[PDB]
């Protein structure tokens, strides 16, 4: 089962370092390169250098090279990219991937990925709101006020089990914090046959995860 | 210092059609072009390695072919889960290794209206001091809507925001979420808040509204 995970998101100030993980499963560790590559905000896909964690050869792109260094350590079966002084233009997202080295080479298997945020702004946990309307009735949960954008929601009924009927927006700055929304549709029926009077929703976020009721009208 | 060049820049077909995307080479690469898929807000997936082997957990109906300076991959039969950003990707002029730089693919289907709904600011919200409004658009085609606020019938402007969902991987539509935010000052001088709705499908505009006491 060949699995490649990566830390989390980060925010950072101009002009401070950083590094980022890349830790690798289900494999012997050395018997494959890895790469990283870095997609700007709404762009494409740019290959960024090599590691071969054997030996710790590493090759990097004409235009990365200077201002990024990569790294590894097979002990811990981890690779690793890091910045001395982070820029504005850093800002973007960036994918570690499994390389083979024989014959004609391909990335075969990916990590989640590491979203890098530079700003001059500070970290802060999502604050939740319910939204209820004033045969099937819908109802929906508003997080705000949180950065990086990296936030995930969940919904579960009373008795802790699971709701399925979810719905995901993307996210929107405003003042240099994200807001997002999630919206649930329950059937008619079982909501007036029932002794069940709210939900729970649940949002998931680097710097604090928080729950909040959700009123059925 | 080898340029991929892909085309066309982004494609519209229907479920049970033929996609045909092509990748051109700057120089001989011999065999030496792979092939990813990228659904958004996930990572790349390897589709075809060394220019026409399907890696294996693949679907069948994904193919490549080519040699040189002229490939192609090819869907036989459009699947309603494919829309995703393809990208070819070069292996023998290392360094750099250079991608191609990507086709859109998007699912057509038939015309749908879409769902509207309005949620009034929580009380919770409230005595924090800002107010806002949600409007919310489900299981639309095509993507193309336009949502309006209205305050005592008075258009808004410049005060709101809204996103876009990705395609269903079922279905193939589009919601909506749209958020007008005020003062909980200004939400309390008027009494009617409405978000109108604007779509192909829809013969004539629809509104959601309601006011402030109820
Ligand atoms: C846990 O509860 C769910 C949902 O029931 C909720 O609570 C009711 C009192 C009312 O508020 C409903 O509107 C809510 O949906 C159960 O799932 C449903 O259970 C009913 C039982 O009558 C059944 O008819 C539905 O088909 C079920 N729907 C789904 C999607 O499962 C669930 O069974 C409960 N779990 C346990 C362990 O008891």
């Known amino acids: 089962e060949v699995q490649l995970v990566q830390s989390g998101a980060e925010v950072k100030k101009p002009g401070e370092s950083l590094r980022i993980s890349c830790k690798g499963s289900g494999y012997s560790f050395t018997s494959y390169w890895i790469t990283w590559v870095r997609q700007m905000p709404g762009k494409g896909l740019e290959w960024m250098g090599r590691i071969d964690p054997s030996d710790s050869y590493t090759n990097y792109s004409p235009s990365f090279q200077g201002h990024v260094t990569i790294s590894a350590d097979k002990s811990i079966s981890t690779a690793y990219l890091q910045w001395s002084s982070l820029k504005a233009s850093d800002t973007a997202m960036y994918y570690c991937?499994?390389?083979?080295?024989?014959?004609?080479?391909?990335?075969?298997?990916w990590g989640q990925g590491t979203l890098v945020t530079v700003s001059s702004g500070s970290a802060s946990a999502p604050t939740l709101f319910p939204l209820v309307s004033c045969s099937s009735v819908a109802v929906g949960c508003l997080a705000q006020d949180f950065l990086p954008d990296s936030i995930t929601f969940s919904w579960k009924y009373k008795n802790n089990s699971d709701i399925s009927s979810t719905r995901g927006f993307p996210s929107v700055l405003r003042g240099g914090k994200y807001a997002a929304t999630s919206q649930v549709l329950l059937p008619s029926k079982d909501v007036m046959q029932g002794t069940d009077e709210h939900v729970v929703c649940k949002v998931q976020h680097p710097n604090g995860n928080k729950e909040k009721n959700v009123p059925l009208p | 210092d080898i340029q991929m060049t892909q085309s066309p820049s982004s494609l519209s077909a229907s479920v049970g059609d033929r996609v045909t995307i092509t990748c051109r080479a700057s120089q001989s690469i011999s065999s030496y072009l792979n092939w990813y898929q990228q659904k958004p807000g996930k990572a790349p997936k390897l589709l075809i390695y060394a220019a026409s082997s399907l890696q294996s957990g693949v679907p069948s109906r994904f193919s490549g072919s080519g040699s040189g300076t002229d490939f192609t991959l090819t869907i036989s039969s459009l699947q309603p889960e494919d829309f995703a950003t393809y990208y070819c990707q070069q292996s023998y002029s290392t360094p750099p290794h250079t991608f191609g730089q990507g086709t859109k693919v998007e699912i057509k289907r038939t015309v749908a209206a879409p769902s509207v709904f309005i949620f009034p600011p929580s009380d919770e919200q409230l005595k924090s001091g800002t107010a806002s409004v949600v409007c919310l658009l489900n299981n639309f085609y095509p993507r193309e809507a336009k949502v309006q606020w209205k305050v005592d019938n008075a258009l808004q402007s410049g005060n709101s925001q809204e996103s876009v969902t990705e395609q269903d991987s079922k279905d193939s539509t589009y919601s909506l979420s749209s958020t007008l935010t005020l003062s909980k000052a200004d939400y309390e001088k008027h009494k009617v808040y409405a978000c109108e709705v604007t779509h192909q499908g829809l013969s004539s505009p629809v509104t959601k509204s309601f006011n402030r006491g109820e």
């Open positions: 991937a499994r390389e083979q080295w024989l014959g004609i080479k391909n990335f075969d298997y």
